[PDB]
PDB file of all heavy atoms in Angstrom:
ATOM      1  N   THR A  61     -10.097  -2.624 -10.161  1.00 50.35           N
ATOM      2  CA  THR A  61      -9.849  -3.735 -11.068  1.00 50.35           C
ATOM      3  C   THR A  61     -10.580  -3.535 -12.388  1.00 50.35           C
ATOM      4  O   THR A  61     -11.651  -2.923 -12.440  1.00 50.35           O
ATOM      5  CB  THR A  61     -10.266  -5.063 -10.429  1.00 50.35           C
ATOM      6  OG1 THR A  61     -10.053  -6.133 -11.358  1.00 50.35           O
ATOM      7  CG2 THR A  61     -11.732  -5.035 -10.011  1.00 50.35           C
ATOM      8  N   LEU A  62      -9.982  -4.044 -13.460  1.00 50.73           N
ATOM      9  CA  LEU A  62     -10.555  -3.952 -14.792  1.00 50.73           C
ATOM     10  C   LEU A  62     -11.036  -5.319 -15.258  1.00 50.73           C
ATOM     11  O   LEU A  62     -10.489  -6.357 -14.874  1.00 50.73           O
ATOM     12  CB  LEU A  62      -9.531  -3.396 -15.783  1.00 50.73           C
ATOM     13  CG  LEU A  62      -8.988  -1.995 -15.500  1.00 50.73           C
ATOM     14  CD1 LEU A  62      -7.940  -1.606 -16.532  1.00 50.73           C
ATOM     15  CD2 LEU A  62     -10.117  -0.979 -15.470  1.00 50.73           C
ATOM     16  N   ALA A  63     -12.070  -5.310 -16.095  1.00 51.10           N
ATOM     17  CA  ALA A  63     -12.612  -6.540 -16.664  1.00 51.10           C
ATOM     18  C   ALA A  63     -11.653  -7.028 -17.742  1.00 51.10           C
ATOM     19  O   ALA A  63     -11.611  -6.480 -18.846  1.00 51.10           O
ATOM     20  CB  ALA A  63     -14.009  -6.306 -17.225  1.00 51.10           C
ATOM     21  N   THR A  64     -10.866  -8.056 -17.413  1.00 51.35           N
ATOM     22  CA  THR A  64      -9.901  -8.589 -18.371  1.00 51.35           C
ATOM     23  C   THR A  64     -10.597  -9.230 -19.565  1.00 51.35           C
ATOM     24  O   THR A  64     -10.181  -9.029 -20.711  1.00 51.35           O
ATOM     25  CB  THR A  64      -8.979  -9.595 -17.684  1.00 51.35           C
ATOM     26  OG1 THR A  64      -9.761 -10.488 -16.880  1.00 51.35           O
ATOM     27  CG2 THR A  64      -7.971  -8.875 -16.802  1.00 51.35           C
ATOM     28  N   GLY A  65     -11.655  -9.999 -19.320  1.00 52.84           N
ATOM     29  CA  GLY A  65     -12.431 -10.561 -20.408  1.00 52.84           C
ATOM     30  C   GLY A  65     -12.394 -12.072 -20.504  1.00 52.84           C
ATOM     31  O   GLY A  65     -12.344 -12.771 -19.487  1.00 52.84           O
ATOM     32  N   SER A  66     -12.419 -12.582 -21.733  1.00 55.38           N
ATOM     33  CA  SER A  66     -12.470 -14.013 -21.973  1.00 55.38           C
ATOM     34  C   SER A  66     -11.151 -14.671 -21.571  1.00 55.38           C
ATOM     35  O   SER A  66     -10.118 -14.003 -21.485  1.00 55.38           O
ATOM     36  CB  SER A  66     -12.777 -14.283 -23.445  1.00 55.38           C
ATOM     37  OG  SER A  66     -11.670 -13.967 -24.266  1.00 55.38           O
ATOM     38  N   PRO A  67     -11.172 -15.979 -21.280  1.00 60.59           N
ATOM     39  CA  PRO A  67      -9.916 -16.666 -20.924  1.00 60.59           C
ATOM     40  C   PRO A  67      -8.842 -16.594 -21.996  1.00 60.59           C
ATOM     41  O   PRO A  67      -7.657 -16.479 -21.663  1.00 60.59           O
ATOM     42  CB  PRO A  67     -10.375 -18.109 -20.677  1.00 60.59           C
ATOM     43  CG  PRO A  67     -11.786 -17.975 -20.243  1.00 60.59           C
ATOM     44  CD  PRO A  67     -12.347 -16.839 -21.046  1.00 60.59           C
ATOM     45  N   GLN A  68      -9.217 -16.656 -23.276  1.00 60.68           N
ATOM     46  CA  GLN A  68      -8.221 -16.498 -24.331  1.00 60.68           C
ATOM     47  C   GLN A  68      -7.693 -15.071 -24.377  1.00 60.68           C
ATOM     48  O   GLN A  68      -6.509 -14.851 -24.652  1.00 60.68           O
ATOM     49  CB  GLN A  68      -8.807 -16.899 -25.682  1.00 60.68           C
ATOM     50  CG  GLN A  68      -8.902 -18.395 -25.890  1.00 60.68           C
ATOM     51  CD  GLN A  68      -9.318 -18.751 -27.297  1.00 60.68           C
ATOM     52  OE1 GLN A  68      -9.606 -17.872 -28.108  1.00 60.68           O
ATOM     53  NE2 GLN A  68      -9.350 -20.043 -27.598  1.00 60.68           N
ATOM     54  N   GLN A  69      -8.555 -14.089 -24.107  1.00 59.86           N
ATOM     55  CA  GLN A  69      -8.103 -12.706 -23.992  1.00 59.86           C
ATOM     56  C   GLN A  69      -7.132 -12.543 -22.828  1.00 59.86           C
ATOM     57  O   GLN A  69      -6.110 -11.854 -22.949  1.00 59.86           O
ATOM     58  CB  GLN A  69      -9.311 -11.788 -23.825  1.00 59.86           C
ATOM     59  CG  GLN A  69      -8.979 -10.354 -23.507  1.00 59.86           C
ATOM     60  CD  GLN A  69     -10.143  -9.419 -23.758  1.00 59.86           C
ATOM     61  OE1 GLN A  69     -11.193  -9.833 -24.246  1.00 59.86           O
ATOM     62  NE2 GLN A  69      -9.962  -8.147 -23.421  1.00 59.86           N
ATOM     63  N   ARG A  70      -7.431 -13.187 -21.699  1.00 57.55           N
ATOM     64  CA  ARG A  70      -6.532 -13.155 -20.551  1.00 57.55           C
ATOM     65  C   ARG A  70      -5.194 -13.805 -20.880  1.00 57.55           C
ATOM     66  O   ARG A  70      -4.135 -13.301 -20.485  1.00 57.55           O
ATOM     67  CB  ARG A  70      -7.190 -13.855 -19.366  1.00 57.55           C
ATOM     68  CG  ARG A  70      -8.357 -13.097 -18.764  1.00 57.55           C
ATOM     69  CD  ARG A  70      -8.647 -13.569 -17.348  1.00 57.55           C
ATOM     70  NE  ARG A  70      -8.805 -15.016 -17.271  1.00 57.55           N
ATOM     71  CZ  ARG A  70      -9.924 -15.665 -17.563  1.00 57.55           C
ATOM     72  NH1 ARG A  70     -11.011 -15.026 -17.963  1.00 57.55           N
ATOM     73  NH2 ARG A  70      -9.952 -16.991 -17.453  1.00 57.55           N
ATOM     74  N   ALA A  71      -5.222 -14.921 -21.610  1.00 57.70           N
ATOM     75  CA  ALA A  71      -3.983 -15.597 -21.977  1.00 57.70           C
ATOM     76  C   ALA A  71      -3.176 -14.778 -22.978  1.00 57.70           C
ATOM     77  O   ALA A  71      -1.942 -14.787 -22.938  1.00 57.70           O
ATOM     78  CB  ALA A  71      -4.291 -16.987 -22.531  1.00 57.70           C
ATOM     79  N   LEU A  72      -3.852 -14.066 -23.886  1.00 55.73           N
ATOM     80  CA  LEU A  72      -3.149 -13.158 -24.790  1.00 55.73           C
ATOM     81  C   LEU A  72      -2.489 -12.021 -24.023  1.00 55.73           C
ATOM     82  O   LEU A  72      -1.352 -11.636 -24.323  1.00 55.73           O
ATOM     83  CB  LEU A  72      -4.108 -12.598 -25.839  1.00 55.73           C
ATOM     84  CG  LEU A  72      -3.460 -11.638 -26.842  1.00 55.73           C
ATOM     85  CD1 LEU A  72      -2.911 -12.373 -28.050  1.00 55.73           C
ATOM     86  CD2 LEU A  72      -4.433 -10.555 -27.268  1.00 55.73           C
ATOM     87  N   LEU A  73      -3.191 -11.471 -23.029  1.00 55.47           N
ATOM     88  CA  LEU A  73      -2.595 -10.431 -22.196  1.00 55.47           C
ATOM     89  C   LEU A  73      -1.382 -10.962 -21.442  1.00 55.47           C
ATOM     90  O   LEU A  73      -0.352 -10.285 -21.349  1.00 55.47           O
ATOM     91  CB  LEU A  73      -3.637  -9.880 -21.225  1.00 55.47           C
ATOM     92  CG  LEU A  73      -3.166  -8.845 -20.203  1.00 55.47           C
ATOM     93  CD1 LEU A  73      -2.492  -7.671 -20.895  1.00 55.47           C
ATOM     94  CD2 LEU A  73      -4.330  -8.371 -19.350  1.00 55.47           C
ATOM     95  N   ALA A  74      -1.481 -12.185 -20.914  1.00 54.32           N
ATOM     96  CA  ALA A  74      -0.351 -12.788 -20.212  1.00 54.32           C
ATOM     97  C   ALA A  74       0.827 -13.031 -21.149  1.00 54.32           C
ATOM     98  O   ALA A  74       1.982 -12.802 -20.774  1.00 54.32           O
ATOM     99  CB  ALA A  74      -0.783 -14.092 -19.544  1.00 54.32           C
ATOM    100  N   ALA A  75       0.555 -13.500 -22.371  1.00 55.57           N
ATOM    101  CA  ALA A  75       1.619 -13.729 -23.343  1.00 55.57           C
ATOM    102  C   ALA A  75       2.293 -12.429 -23.756  1.00 55.57           C
ATOM    103  O   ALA A  75       3.512 -12.402 -23.959  1.00 55.57           O
ATOM    104  CB  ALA A  75       1.064 -14.450 -24.571  1.00 55.57           C
TER     105      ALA A  75
END
Side-chain angles (χ1 to χ4, degrees):
Chain A
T61 178
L62 299 178
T64 46
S66 72
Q68 283 187 356
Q69 172 163 356
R70 290 200 308 278
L72 180 89
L73 176 55

